[PDB]
Short mmCIF file of all heavy atoms in Angstrom, two decimals:
data_model
loop_
_atom_site.label_atom_id
_atom_site.label_comp_id
_atom_site.label_asym_id
_atom_site.label_seq_id
_atom_site.Cartn_x
_atom_site.Cartn_y
_atom_site.Cartn_z
N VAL A 606 -81.25 65.90 -107.11
CA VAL A 606 -81.00 67.36 -107.30
C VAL A 606 -80.70 67.79 -105.97
O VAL A 606 -81.56 67.92 -105.08
CB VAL A 606 -82.14 67.93 -107.86
CG1 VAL A 606 -82.00 69.47 -108.08
CG2 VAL A 606 -82.34 67.36 -109.31
N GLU A 607 -79.39 68.25 -105.70
CA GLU A 607 -79.04 68.85 -104.39
C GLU A 607 -79.40 70.27 -104.48
O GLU A 607 -79.88 70.87 -103.52
CB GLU A 607 -77.45 68.67 -104.15
CG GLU A 607 -77.08 68.67 -102.63
CD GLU A 607 -77.72 69.84 -101.72
OE1 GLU A 607 -77.92 70.99 -102.09
OE2 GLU A 607 -78.21 69.40 -100.54
N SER A 608 -79.10 70.90 -105.59
CA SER A 608 -79.46 72.32 -105.92
C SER A 608 -79.46 72.62 -107.39
O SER A 608 -78.65 72.06 -108.07
CB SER A 608 -78.54 73.19 -105.14
OG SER A 608 -77.40 73.60 -105.84
N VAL A 609 -80.26 73.57 -107.73
CA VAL A 609 -80.15 74.21 -109.00
C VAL A 609 -79.93 75.77 -108.87
O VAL A 609 -80.59 76.47 -108.15
CB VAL A 609 -81.37 73.97 -110.00
CG1 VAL A 609 -81.93 72.53 -109.69
CG2 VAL A 609 -82.49 74.90 -109.67
N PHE A 610 -78.65 76.08 -109.46
CA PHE A 610 -78.33 77.47 -109.56
C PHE A 610 -78.71 77.96 -110.96
O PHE A 610 -78.07 77.63 -111.97
CB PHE A 610 -76.77 77.57 -109.47
CG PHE A 610 -76.38 78.80 -108.95
CD1 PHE A 610 -75.18 78.99 -108.32
CD2 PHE A 610 -77.29 79.96 -109.01
CE1 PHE A 610 -74.76 80.27 -107.84
CE2 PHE A 610 -76.85 81.21 -108.47
CZ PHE A 610 -75.70 81.40 -107.89
N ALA A 611 -79.75 78.84 -111.05
CA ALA A 611 -80.39 79.20 -112.25
C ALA A 611 -80.28 80.75 -112.57
O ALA A 611 -80.71 81.59 -111.63
CB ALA A 611 -81.79 78.78 -112.40
N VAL A 612 -79.74 81.13 -113.82
CA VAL A 612 -79.68 82.60 -114.16
C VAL A 612 -80.18 82.79 -115.50
O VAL A 612 -79.92 81.99 -116.42
CB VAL A 612 -78.26 82.89 -114.11
CG1 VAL A 612 -77.89 83.27 -112.69
CG2 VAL A 612 -77.32 81.63 -114.60
N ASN A 613 -81.00 83.88 -115.66
CA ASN A 613 -81.56 84.28 -116.89
C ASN A 613 -80.79 85.54 -117.33
O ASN A 613 -80.60 86.42 -116.53
CB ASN A 613 -83.08 84.77 -116.76
CG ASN A 613 -83.31 85.48 -115.41
OD1 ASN A 613 -82.33 85.78 -114.75
ND2 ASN A 613 -84.55 85.88 -115.17
N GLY A 614 -80.41 85.40 -118.70
CA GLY A 614 -79.59 86.55 -119.20
C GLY A 614 -78.26 85.96 -119.66
O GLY A 614 -77.63 86.56 -120.56
N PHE A 615 -77.86 84.87 -119.04
CA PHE A 615 -76.74 84.00 -119.62
C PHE A 615 -77.26 82.88 -120.55
O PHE A 615 -77.34 81.79 -120.19
CB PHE A 615 -76.09 83.26 -118.42
CG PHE A 615 -74.83 82.44 -118.87
CD1 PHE A 615 -73.89 82.93 -119.94
CD2 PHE A 615 -74.44 81.41 -118.07
CE1 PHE A 615 -72.76 82.11 -120.18
CE2 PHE A 615 -73.21 80.67 -118.27
CZ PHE A 615 -72.31 80.93 -119.40
N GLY A 616 -77.55 83.33 -121.75
CA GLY A 616 -77.92 82.25 -122.75
C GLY A 616 -76.57 81.61 -123.14
O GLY A 616 -75.53 82.18 -122.68
N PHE A 617 -76.55 80.70 -124.05
CA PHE A 617 -75.25 80.34 -124.64
C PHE A 617 -75.09 80.72 -126.11
O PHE A 617 -74.18 80.22 -126.76
CB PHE A 617 -74.97 78.84 -124.42
CG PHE A 617 -75.83 77.80 -125.09
CD1 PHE A 617 -75.51 76.50 -124.96
CD2 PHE A 617 -76.96 78.13 -125.82
CE1 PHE A 617 -76.34 75.49 -125.58
CE2 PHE A 617 -77.82 77.21 -126.43
CZ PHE A 617 -77.47 75.85 -126.31
N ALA A 618 -75.74 81.80 -126.58
CA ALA A 618 -75.53 82.17 -128.01
C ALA A 618 -75.90 83.55 -128.01
O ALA A 618 -75.85 84.21 -129.03
CB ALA A 618 -76.40 81.40 -129.06
N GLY A 619 -76.33 84.10 -126.86
CA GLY A 619 -76.63 85.49 -126.69
C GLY A 619 -76.83 85.82 -125.33
O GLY A 619 -76.57 84.88 -124.47
N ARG A 620 -77.32 87.03 -125.06
CA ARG A 620 -77.85 87.34 -123.76
C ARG A 620 -79.19 87.98 -123.95
O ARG A 620 -79.98 87.65 -124.87
CB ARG A 620 -77.06 88.24 -122.79
CG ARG A 620 -75.58 87.78 -122.67
CD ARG A 620 -74.72 88.11 -123.98
NE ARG A 620 -73.26 88.11 -123.82
CZ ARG A 620 -72.71 88.98 -122.91
NH1 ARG A 620 -73.39 89.96 -122.17
NH2 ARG A 620 -71.37 89.01 -122.80
N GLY A 621 -79.62 88.65 -122.86
CA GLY A 621 -80.87 89.38 -122.96
C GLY A 621 -82.00 88.66 -122.34
O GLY A 621 -81.87 87.48 -122.15
N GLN A 622 -82.94 89.42 -121.80
CA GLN A 622 -84.06 88.94 -121.16
C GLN A 622 -84.48 87.55 -121.71
O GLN A 622 -85.31 86.82 -120.99
CB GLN A 622 -85.16 90.04 -121.28
CG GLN A 622 -84.52 91.42 -121.01
CD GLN A 622 -85.60 92.53 -120.67
OE1 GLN A 622 -85.31 93.75 -120.96
NE2 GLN A 622 -86.71 92.14 -120.08
N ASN A 623 -84.17 87.25 -122.95
CA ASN A 623 -84.84 86.18 -123.70
C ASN A 623 -84.42 84.94 -123.02
O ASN A 623 -85.23 84.34 -122.35
CB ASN A 623 -84.71 86.34 -125.17
CG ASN A 623 -84.35 85.07 -125.96
OD1 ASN A 623 -83.59 85.10 -126.91
ND2 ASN A 623 -84.92 83.89 -125.51
N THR A 624 -83.20 84.52 -123.21
CA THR A 624 -82.68 83.24 -122.75
C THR A 624 -82.12 83.19 -121.34
O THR A 624 -81.70 84.35 -120.81
CB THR A 624 -81.44 82.78 -123.61
OG1 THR A 624 -80.29 83.46 -123.25
CG2 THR A 624 -81.72 83.12 -125.04
N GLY A 625 -81.91 81.99 -120.64
CA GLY A 625 -81.29 81.90 -119.45
C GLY A 625 -80.85 80.45 -119.40
O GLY A 625 -81.08 79.65 -120.21
N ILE A 626 -80.18 80.04 -118.27
CA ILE A 626 -79.63 78.70 -118.22
C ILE A 626 -79.65 78.26 -116.77
O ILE A 626 -79.21 79.09 -115.93
CB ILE A 626 -78.36 78.60 -119.02
CG1 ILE A 626 -77.74 77.25 -119.00
CG2 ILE A 626 -77.35 79.54 -118.39
CD1 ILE A 626 -76.34 77.35 -119.39
N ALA A 627 -79.86 76.95 -116.45
CA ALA A 627 -80.00 76.54 -115.09
C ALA A 627 -79.00 75.47 -114.71
O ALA A 627 -79.12 74.33 -115.07
CB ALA A 627 -81.34 76.02 -114.81
N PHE A 628 -77.92 75.76 -113.97
CA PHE A 628 -77.00 74.78 -113.58
C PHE A 628 -77.50 74.02 -112.29
O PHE A 628 -78.01 74.63 -111.43
CB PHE A 628 -75.64 75.39 -113.14
CG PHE A 628 -75.06 76.30 -114.20
CD1 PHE A 628 -75.42 77.72 -114.23
CD2 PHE A 628 -74.01 75.82 -115.01
CE1 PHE A 628 -74.85 78.60 -115.18
CE2 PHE A 628 -73.37 76.76 -115.78
CZ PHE A 628 -73.83 78.18 -115.86
N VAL A 629 -77.45 72.68 -112.39
CA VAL A 629 -77.92 71.80 -111.35
C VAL A 629 -76.88 70.80 -110.72
O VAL A 629 -76.24 70.08 -111.51
CB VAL A 629 -79.20 71.16 -111.69
CG1 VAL A 629 -79.08 70.59 -113.12
CG2 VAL A 629 -79.45 69.91 -110.78
N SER A 630 -76.70 70.98 -109.44
CA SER A 630 -75.87 70.17 -108.60
C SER A 630 -76.55 69.03 -107.90
O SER A 630 -77.41 69.29 -107.05
CB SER A 630 -75.01 71.02 -107.63
OG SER A 630 -75.66 72.23 -107.27
N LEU A 631 -76.16 67.76 -108.21
CA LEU A 631 -76.88 66.63 -107.65
C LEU A 631 -76.34 66.23 -106.25
O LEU A 631 -75.56 67.05 -105.73
CB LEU A 631 -76.62 65.40 -108.60
CG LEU A 631 -77.01 65.68 -109.99
CD1 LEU A 631 -76.32 64.62 -110.83
CD2 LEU A 631 -78.40 65.54 -110.21
N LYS A 632 -76.70 65.13 -105.70
CA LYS A 632 -76.22 64.60 -104.44
C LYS A 632 -75.10 63.57 -104.60
O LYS A 632 -75.18 62.86 -105.77
CB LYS A 632 -77.41 64.10 -103.53
CG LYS A 632 -78.27 65.21 -103.01
CD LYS A 632 -79.47 64.77 -102.22
CE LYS A 632 -80.38 65.89 -102.01
NZ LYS A 632 -81.22 66.07 -100.79
N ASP A 633 -74.32 63.47 -103.70
CA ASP A 633 -73.13 62.53 -103.73
C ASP A 633 -73.39 61.21 -104.58
O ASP A 633 -74.33 60.49 -104.31
CB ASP A 633 -72.57 62.25 -102.43
CG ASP A 633 -71.15 61.84 -102.40
OD1 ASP A 633 -70.45 62.23 -103.42
OD2 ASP A 633 -70.63 61.10 -101.51
#
């Protein structure tokens, strides 16, 4: 795990305080 970019409010079937999703970038 080189980094995780994580945002709440970007669900994939809705938004709202409820869901979020965490994008993670590994190392080479």
